[PDB]
């Protein structure tokens, strides 16, 4: 993973990625965030407590143009798993 290490260093160290700022060119722009929900299982509905316990998986999709790279320049890497 010389290429993934190099790509992560390029994206974050070299270009100076700042996770505190939103991915926008100007502050007045808004970030599109698409959401979907998968119900893995409905655990319970407690009537006395009036509480629903669910197991859900929340699918988020958005765009961060600071995290863009041309794959051919980095060993044809097309996707990264990041914390």
């Amino acid at each position: 993973l010389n290429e993934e290490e190099r790509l992560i260093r390029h994206l974050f160290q070299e270009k100076g990625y700042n996770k505190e700022l939103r991915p926008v060119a100007h502050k007045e722009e808004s970030v599109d965030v698409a959401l979907a929900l998968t119900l893995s299982n409905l655990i319970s509905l407690k009537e006395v407590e009036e509480t629903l316990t669910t197991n859900v998986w929340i699918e988020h999709g958005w765009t961060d143009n600071r995290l863009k790279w041309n794959a051919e320049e980095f060993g044809n890497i097309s996707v990264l798993r990041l914390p």
Binding site: L1, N2, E3, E4, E5, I8, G75, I77, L82, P83
Partner: peptide, 12 residues
């Protein structure tokens, strides 16, 4: 060392 990167010599 990088804990983000998978621990092998080539990404393929």
């Amino acid at each position: 060392y990088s804990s983000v990167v998978r621990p092998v010599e080539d990404h393929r």
